[PDB]
Amino acid sequence: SKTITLYLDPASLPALNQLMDFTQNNEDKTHPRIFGLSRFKIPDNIITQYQNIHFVELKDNRPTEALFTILDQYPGNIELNIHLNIAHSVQLIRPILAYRFKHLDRVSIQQLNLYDDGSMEYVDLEKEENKDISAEIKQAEKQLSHYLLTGKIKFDNPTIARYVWQSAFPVKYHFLSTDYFEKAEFLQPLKEYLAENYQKMDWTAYQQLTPEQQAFYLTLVGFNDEVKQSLEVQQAKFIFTGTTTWEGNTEVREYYAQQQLNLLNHFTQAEGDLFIGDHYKIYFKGHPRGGEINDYILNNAKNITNIPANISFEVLMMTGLLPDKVGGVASSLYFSLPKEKISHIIFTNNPYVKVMRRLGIIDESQVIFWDSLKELG
Numbered sequence: 001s002k003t004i005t006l007y008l009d010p011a012s013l014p015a016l017n018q019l020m021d022f023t024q025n026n027e028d029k030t031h032p033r034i035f036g037l038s039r040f041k042i043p044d045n046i047i048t049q050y051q052n053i054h055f056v057e058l059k060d061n062r063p064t065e066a067l068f069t070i071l072d073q074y075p076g077n078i079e080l081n082i083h084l085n086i087a088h089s090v091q092l093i094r095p096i097l098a099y100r101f102k103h104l105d106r107v108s109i110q111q112l113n114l115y116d117d118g119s120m121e122y123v124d125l126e127k128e129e130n131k132d133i134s135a136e137i138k139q140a141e142k143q144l145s146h147y148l149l150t151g152k153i154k155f156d157n158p159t160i161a162r163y164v165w166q167s168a169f170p171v172k173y174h175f176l177s178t179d180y181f182e183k184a185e186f187l188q189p190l191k192e193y194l195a196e197n198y199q200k201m202d203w204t205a206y207q208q209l210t211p212e213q214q215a216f217y218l219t220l221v222g223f224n225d226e227v228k229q230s231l232e233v234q235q236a237k238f239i240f241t242g243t244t245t246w247e248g249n250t251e252v253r254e255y256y257a258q259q260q261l262n263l264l265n266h267f268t269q270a271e272g273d274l275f276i277g278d279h280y281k282i283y284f285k286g287h288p289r290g291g292e293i294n295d296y297i298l299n300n301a302k303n304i305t306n307i308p309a310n311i312s313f314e315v316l317m318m319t320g321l322l323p324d325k326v327g328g329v330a331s332s333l334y335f336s337l338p339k340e341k342i343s344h345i346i347f348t349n350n351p352y353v354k355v356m357r358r359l360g361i362i363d364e365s366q367v368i369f370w371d372s373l374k375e376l377g
């Protein structure tokens with residue numbers, strides 16, 4: 001049989017890891033590959049070097065039936081090597097299971113590689129604090145069994161169902177935070193259940209690539225020379241991190257733009273509650289989905305250097321280009337940021353807060369929210 005590798009991710013963290021996997025394997029120019037990465041366009045110069053390389057759109061967190069046409073090109077026995085986003089794993093593998101169903105003799109699942117979406121997994125697990133995890137796991141395994149057998153999705157506990165793929169396939173999980181699993185006492189039954197099927201995301205993998213593969217990887221994530229250089233200057237550096245909002249509105253986006261500009265000034269103005277001192281060069285790392293929110297900071301702020309919003313913050317870590325201090329709105333990027341580089345984390349009782357306090361990312365101090373900082377200026 002042939003092995004076909006599928007890389008599916010609507011978000012960004014998993015994509016970063018999958019792109020690394022691609023890079024690590026990039027010597028093989030003919031291994032069938034199917035990219036379903038909503039946030040990363042593989043440039044055409046790289047595309048033209050590979051054969052049997054395919055692309056599928058995602059819609060509603062699942063590949064479209066365009067996937068069937070790709071797969072039909074491989075008439076032999078095929079084994080599926082699948083990389084997914086943990087939070088949306090159930091939906092992302094739905095059409096693959098559907099296709100498998102129409103082709104039992106030829107199509108089988110080799111294994112699954114699951115990666116965290118971000119803070120979302122943790123916030124959702126935090127909400128199961130009061131439940132009997134052990135009982136929840138068994139229900140999940142049983143319901144997953146029904147899905148695999150009927151194609152129908154029905155989970156009493158959709159959060160816990162994300163973690164029971166062991167019962168069906170060889171799987172490896174890559175967690176943003178292993179600590180959460182090891183330290184949260186109510187999750188001890190999930191931890192033991194997972195046994196040897198998980199590991200921490202290895203942010204040092206980049207260091208082990210050859211220099212040409214590094215240049216290659218940088219092209220996939222879009223970390224160009226111009227950005228690299230401004231982060232190599234020899235001066236004290238602070239990066240303000242932006243956030244965004246789902247709420248496809250305007251009054252909310254606008255409000256978020258205003259508050260985030262205010263939060264910036266609390267960091268950068270002498271009268272601010274968060275004032276960092278006047279010995280740092282200021283940088284802005286807007287949120288990749290910030291849109292107008294990011295424009296708003298660049299249009300109204302003063303002596304600040306922009307790090308193109310599309311570049312995922314974790315790329316700076318991999319390339320060793322982390323600044324001295326990082327501050328801004330609570331974000332998935334703070335789960336992997338070295339502790340001594342945290343200036344201050346602000347939020348917009350609260351499970352996101354509970355998660356970060358449990359992980360020690362924030363202390364017992366007293367959470368600062370958006371709306372408690374006065375309008376400076």
Ligand SMILES: Nc1ccn([C@@H]2O[C@H](COP(=O)(O)O)[C@@H](O)[C@H]2O)c(=O)n1
Binds near residue numbers: 013288309311
């Ligand atoms: N200011 C920001 C915010 C998020 N991000 C990217 O978006 C991902 C998810 O972030 P949020 O949890 O903040 O939505 C982060 O892991 C990071 O890769 C960024 O690069 N810069």
